[PDB]
């Protein structure tokens, strides 16, 4: 089997990134943030505190006729920007772009932090690291991938993210028409949960190549591209007048500025980021300050190749007995 579904810009800066999920019968169709950084699929729902609901679509597992309450199953996830939610736990039926995995455990939650309050165009989050990181007890639940991995052509699936425009995941094969030139395979380590590798460089514009090796996360879910300290001043450097803000949590520059591009090495390939991907606009409404897409990993403990990286890539998320990443231009 495969399945194949478009996954949209929540906002006009790509702040994240939703796709269509069905769960339940008759379907519920809820907007989730595909998630290679975490493996719990939860949802808002009926369950909700509804003082934290405002917008989002909730699903109903009571109006499912395959849903199943997993007795005396709960759920809490503490992500590393400190958002949070905790719920209990269905099994039920979930459809993404045609590929249909039945007994999911799908994750109701019964309360949510801010964050995920406030952000009325994101109904949950659909993990795709490893299962090894699932929060649910006392007994720890499969994502939808490792749930629909047998049964797939391949066991893999593929991110494809736009910038300022939709793009695709897909399951179960490899779209050789949405990328250009080769895909490049990498090594990955699960020990920590998540797709780690080793990236083996950069450059920053026309800049000369830096072979060094920078361990990190091919994410999803976070935004912005997290990198040592060292290699983002070098980005930032070449920006007139840019400068890291202790007060607005990184590094800003003017919005009249034209970014420079950023490569990273995957093996003996390169990615280019180009410079306008760098982009996140006005630090606060009216602002001629702009908020750079590449920020310093030191507070965070890990460097974190999220979107900024990614939407650059054609990137395959290879679940084969040893797990591997490909990355393509495009
Ligand atoms: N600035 C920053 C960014 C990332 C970070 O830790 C990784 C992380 C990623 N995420 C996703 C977004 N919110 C829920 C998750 O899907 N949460 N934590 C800590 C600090
Ligand atoms: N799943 C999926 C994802 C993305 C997608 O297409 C995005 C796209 C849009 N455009 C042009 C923009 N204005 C004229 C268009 O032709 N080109 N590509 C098609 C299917």
Same mark, same amino acid.
């Given at each position: 089997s495969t399945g194949s579904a478009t996954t949209t810009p929540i906002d006009s800066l790509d702040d994240a990134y939703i796709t269509p999920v069905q769960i339940g019968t008759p379907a519920q169709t809820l907007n989730l943030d595909? @998630? /290679?950084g975490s493996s719990d699929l939860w949802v808002f729902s009926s369950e909700t505190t509804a003082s934290e609901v405002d917008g989002q679509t909730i699903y109903t597992?009571?109006?499912? =006729? *395959?849903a199943k309450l997993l007795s005396g199953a709960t759920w809490s996830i503490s992500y590393g920007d400190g958002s949070s939610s905790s719920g209990d736990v269905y099994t039920d039926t979930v459809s993404v772009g045609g590929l249909t995995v039945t007994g999911q455990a799908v994750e109701s939650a019964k309360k949510v932090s801010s964050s995920f309050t406030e @952000?009325? =165009?994101?109904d949950g989050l659909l993990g795709l690291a490893?299962? /090894?990181?699932? =929060?649910?007890?006392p007994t720890q639940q499969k994502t939808f991938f490792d749930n629909a991995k047998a049964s797939l052509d391949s066991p893999v699936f593929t991110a494809d993210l736009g910038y300022h425009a939709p793009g695709t995941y897909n399951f !179960?094969?490899? @779209? *050789? =028409?949405?990328? *250009? !030139?080769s895909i490049t395979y990498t090594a990955v380590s699960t020990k920590q949960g998540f797709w780690e590798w080793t990236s083996t460089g950069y450059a920053v514009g026309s800049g000369t190549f830096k072979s060094t090796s920078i361990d990190g996360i091919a994410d999803t879910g976070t935004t912005l591209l997290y990198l040592p300290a060292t290699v983002v001043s070098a980005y930032w450097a070449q920006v007139s007048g840019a400068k890291s803000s202790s007060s607005v949590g990184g590094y800003v520059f003017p919005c009249s500025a034209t970014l420079p591009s950023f490569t990273f090495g995957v093996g003996s390939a390169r990615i280019v980021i180009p410079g306008d991907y760098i982009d996140f606009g006005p630090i606060s409404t009216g602002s001629s300050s702009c908020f750079g897409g590449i920020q310093s990993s030191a507070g965070i403990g890990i460097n974190i190749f999220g979107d900024v990286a990614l939407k650059a890539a054609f990137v395959v998320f290879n679940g084969a007995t040893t797990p591997t990443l490909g990355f393509a231009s495009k």
């Open positions: 595909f @998630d /290679t597992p009571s109006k499912s =006729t *395959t @952000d009325s =165009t994101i490893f299962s /090894t990181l699932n =929060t649910v007890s !179960g094969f490899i @779209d *050789t =028409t949405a990328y *250009t !030139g």
